[PDB]
Design an enzyme around this catalytic site. Sequence first.
Site, PDB file in Angstrom:
ATOM      1  N   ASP A  37       0.800  -1.235   0.000  1.00  0.00           N
ATOM      2  CA  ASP A  37       0.000   0.000   0.000  1.00  0.00           C
ATOM      3  C   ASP A  37       0.833   1.286   0.000  1.00  0.00           C
ATOM      4  O   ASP A  37       1.274   1.754   1.065  1.00  0.00           O
ATOM      5  CB  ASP A  37      -0.921  -0.017   1.234  1.00  0.00           C
ATOM      6  CG  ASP A  37      -1.955   1.099   1.231  1.00  0.00           C
ATOM      7  OD1 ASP A  37      -2.174   1.757   0.187  1.00  0.00           O
ATOM      8  OD2 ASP A  37      -2.573   1.298   2.294  1.00  0.00           O
ATOM      9  N   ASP A 222      -1.043   5.594  -5.641  1.00  0.00           N
ATOM     10  CA  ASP A 222      -1.536   4.736  -4.546  1.00  0.00           C
ATOM     11  C   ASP A 222      -1.889   3.306  -4.980  1.00  0.00           C
ATOM     12  O   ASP A 222      -2.956   3.070  -5.547  1.00  0.00           O
ATOM     13  CB  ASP A 222      -2.745   5.393  -3.840  1.00  0.00           C
ATOM     14  CG  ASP A 222      -3.313   4.528  -2.714  1.00  0.00           C
ATOM     15  OD1 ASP A 222      -2.657   3.538  -2.322  1.00  0.00           O
ATOM     16  OD2 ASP A 222      -4.422   4.844  -2.223  1.00  0.00           O
TER      17      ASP A 222
HETATM   18  C1  LIG Z   1      -7.315   4.005   7.254  1.00  0.00           C
HETATM   19  C2  LIG Z   1      -6.412   3.189   6.358  1.00  0.00           C
HETATM   20  C3  LIG Z   1      -6.784   2.984   5.024  1.00  0.00           C
HETATM   21  C4  LIG Z   1      -5.979   2.243   4.153  1.00  0.00           C
HETATM   22  C5  LIG Z   1      -6.376   1.975   2.716  1.00  0.00           C
HETATM   23  C6  LIG Z   1      -7.045   0.619   2.666  1.00  0.00           C
HETATM   24  C7  LIG Z   1      -7.475  -0.037   3.827  1.00  0.00           C
HETATM   25  C8  LIG Z   1      -8.105  -1.284   3.756  1.00  0.00           C
HETATM   26  C9  LIG Z   1      -8.329  -1.891   2.518  1.00  0.00           C
HETATM   27  C10 LIG Z   1      -7.892  -1.251   1.365  1.00  0.00           C
HETATM   28  C11 LIG Z   1      -8.125  -1.845   0.024  1.00  0.00           C
HETATM   29  C12 LIG Z   1      -9.282  -2.596  -0.208  1.00  0.00           C
HETATM   30  N1  LIG Z   1      -9.509  -3.116  -1.427  1.00  0.00           N
HETATM   31  C13 LIG Z   1      -8.666  -2.932  -2.450  1.00  0.00           C
HETATM   32  C14 LIG Z   1      -7.498  -2.193  -2.270  1.00  0.00           C
HETATM   33 CL1  LIG Z   1      -6.381  -1.962  -3.649  1.00  0.00          CL
HETATM   34  C15 LIG Z   1      -7.218  -1.635  -1.029  1.00  0.00           C
HETATM   35  C16 LIG Z   1      -7.267  -0.012   1.443  1.00  0.00           C
HETATM   36  C17 LIG Z   1      -7.376   3.019   2.224  1.00  0.00           C
HETATM   37  O1  LIG Z   1      -6.663   3.653   1.149  1.00  0.00           O
HETATM   38  C18 LIG Z   1      -5.378   3.008   0.966  1.00  0.00           C
HETATM   39  N2  LIG Z   1      -4.472   3.384   0.052  1.00  0.00           N
HETATM   40  N3  LIG Z   1      -5.229   2.061   1.791  1.00  0.00           N
HETATM   41  C19 LIG Z   1      -4.800   1.698   4.642  1.00  0.00           C
HETATM   42  C20 LIG Z   1      -4.415   1.899   5.958  1.00  0.00           C
HETATM   43  C21 LIG Z   1      -5.210   2.657   6.813  1.00  0.00           C
HETATM   44  O2  LIG Z   1      -4.790   2.765   8.106  1.00  0.00           O
HETATM   45  C22 LIG Z   1      -4.218   3.850   8.787  1.00  0.00           C
HETATM   46  F1  LIG Z   1      -3.056   3.342   9.282  1.00  0.00           F
HETATM   47  F2  LIG Z   1      -4.069   4.935   7.963  1.00  0.00           F
END
Ligand SMILES: Cc1cc([C@@]2(c3cccc(-c4cncc(Cl)c4)c3)COC(N)=N2)ccc1OC(F)F
Length: 379
Positions: A37, A222
């Site tokens: 991520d 992203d």
């Molecule tokens: C609040 C939060 C959100 C995220 C997030 C995310 C969370 C859960 C699932 C997915 C996801 C689901 N389905 C397909 C995909 Cl490709 C991703 C993406 C939201 O946006 C991004 N880039 N990642 C990551 C960590 C966070 O925690 C905090 F530490 F900031």
Amino acid sequence: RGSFVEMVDNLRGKSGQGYYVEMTVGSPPQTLNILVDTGSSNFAVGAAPHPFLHRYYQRQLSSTYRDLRKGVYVPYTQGKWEGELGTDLVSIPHGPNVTVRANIAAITESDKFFINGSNWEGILGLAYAEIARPDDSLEPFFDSLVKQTHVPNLFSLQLCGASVGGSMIIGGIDHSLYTGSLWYTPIRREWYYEVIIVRVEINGQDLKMDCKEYNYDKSIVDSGTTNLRLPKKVFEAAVASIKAASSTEKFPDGFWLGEQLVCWQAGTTPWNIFPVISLYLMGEVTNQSFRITILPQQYLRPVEDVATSQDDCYKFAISQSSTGTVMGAVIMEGFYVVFDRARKRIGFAVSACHVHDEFRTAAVEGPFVTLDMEDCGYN
Ligand SMILES: Cc1cc([C@@]2(c3cccc(-c4cncc(Cl)c4)c3)COC(N)=N2)ccc1OC(F)F
Ligand code: NA
Ligand code: NA
């Protein structure tokens, strides 16, 4: 440098559910699948038997766990996650032959975070400390990796669309993963991987919008977002232009809003009625830009799970935003993307794996002359 065969093909995924890498945590090692991520900065893993999870981090089993006696609460739209902070030893079996002590958020309670049916159990936030939770003093995984080892301060990503696959090359570049040259755009600020779009073309036609709109209030690269997400005003203009170019056939108005899918008989998806989309990015030199170009193959996402249908069903993978432009897998799947942290720049090259046809391919071309590129950034 240039060749890292043991890291090729180390990513897996299901369409619309992101790409994950195998990691181990604790001693003895516990294997987990972890979402890659570039849009966040926490290493956060499932640490309790939530029903969607194949497995979870069992701190009690690790002789190297250290508690930080600090909790973390993270709310977002329609949900949350909550966890407890500590550190433990972390390796990437198909990454560099090293082991580091990293911050881990052990997730103890969540709502709408994990996906029912997915094969990953945690998230590797590869972005910067500025956006870490609870605060910027929690050192992100990649910062720890660089501090503690001789791994160079960069990583690159080849995401391959369609069960999907790809490569994460940690500490370098693999030249077999792209064709032609890499072109670089500056990282505007080290929080998200923030960049500046200076011009947008649909099938060669300029949206002629004040370029500040393209970046309202930011643009980011992203890997943890599926779609290309465009600010409301830019999205409106983008579809209006896409609607026009593709009016050879008609689709429901809700389709462009991703509120319904659209279907064609197999083998009979008409790609050619759809326009290419070109983003011009700020270059490395004053008044110089380059452009990256994607196909409908990238922005019309295959949807497999439809019991209402039996054909080729696609979702329109471009959508509005109130958080700015987000170059998600839609964009990244077209390119080899180098997150060149040491030099504060992101490299793009045509991906050796990207999905195309015999008429059109994704492209990275430059240089172009573009003036007042600094005016395109939002303050
Ligand atoms: C609040 C939060 C959100 C995220 C997030 C995310 C969370 C859960 C699932 C997915 C996801 C689901 N389905 C397909 C995909 Cl490709 C991703 C993406 C939201 O946006 C991004 N880039 N990642 C990551 C960590 C966070 O925690 C905090 F530490 F900031
Ligand atoms: Na180092
Ligand atoms: Na190459």
